[PDB]
């Protein structure tokens, strides 16, 4: 009724409150590192041979 | 020569790092699956330590080669009874870093292979076959490159 009404719903006591509480809601990566560290070390190859 | 047996104390390590992986996202049975396992370890072990020594032995003199001079100049700093140094600490100033760099790049190897094989190709395959091939492969692959 307060509601249809727009009075003040907070004026209607309820029966009892729950609070709940609510705290919230990588191959290629290892492919990417070994791939960039083992190019790096093609051209420390490169570089020694060189 | 004799050196070797650190090759062997080397080459073995990396052949069976993925089992944890595997016994976490393939769940292999790691009962059943030593069978394979011991195998794959010993054959990589193997033919891995004979690449170290490949690789370092067909390459160690670049280092001479390049740094001789250097290391020539600081042996003096520091022509019979002067060449003795050259036998006693020159031929290992080149050998320490080979070694170094021979299993240094043969281990940076490895891991590629391993990981494409079975995160890009054998995705699509029974872990069974995904552990078999992707190790097999990246054995015998590697061990044939370093032969190159």
């Known amino acids: 009724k307060a509601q249809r009404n727009n009075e003040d719903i907070s004026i209607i006591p309820p029966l009892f409150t729950v609070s709940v509480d609510h705290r919230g809601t ?14 790096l070390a ?7 041979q060189a | 020569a004799k050196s070797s047996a650190l090759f062997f104390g080397n080459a073995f390590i990396v052949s069976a790092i993925p089992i944890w992986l ?17 195998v794959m370890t010993l054959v990589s072990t193997y033919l891995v330590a004979f690449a ?13 080669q390049k740094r001789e001079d250097a290391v020539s100049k600081e042996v003096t700093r520091k022509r019979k009874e002067k060449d003795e140094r050259i036998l006693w600490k020159k031929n290992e ?13 043969n281990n940076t190897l490895f891991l590629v292979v391993v990981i494409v094989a079975s995160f890009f190709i054998l995705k699509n395959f029974n872990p069974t076959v995904n552990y ?13 490159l370093s032969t190159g």
Do not use: C, P
């Open chain 1, 26 to 39: 990588t191959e290629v990566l290892a492919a990417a590192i070994g791939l960039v560290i083992y190019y």
């Open chain 1, 42 to 48: 093609f051209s420390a190859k490169s570089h020694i």
């Open chain 2, 22 to 38: 595997y016994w976490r996202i393939w769940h292999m049975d790691l009962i059943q699956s030593a069978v394979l396992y011991s």
């Open chain 2, 52 to 64: 170290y020594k490949n690789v370092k032995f067909v390459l160690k003199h670049k280092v001479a």
């Open chain 2, 93 to 105: 100033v080149a050998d320490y870093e080979a070694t170094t760099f021979s299993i240094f790049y």
């Open chain 2, 132 to 144: 078999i091939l992707s190790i097999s492969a990246s054995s015998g692959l590697i061990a044939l």
